[PDB]
Amino acid sequence: TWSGTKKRAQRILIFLLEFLLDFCTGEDSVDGKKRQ
Numbered sequence: 001t002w003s004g005t006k007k008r009a010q011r012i013l014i015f016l017l018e019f020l021l022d023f024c025t026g027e028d029s030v031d032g033k034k035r036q
Contacts (some may be wrong), residue, residue: 024030
């Protein structure tokens with residue numbers, strides 16, 4: 001299922017994903033009131 005509509009957004013998703021994983025790289029996580 002190829003879609004070229006949000007293909008640029010898919011790239012940004014990679015960045016945001018990598019950030020999330022990097023930020024939450026610890027096993028203890030950051031769920032102790034992440035101020036969300």
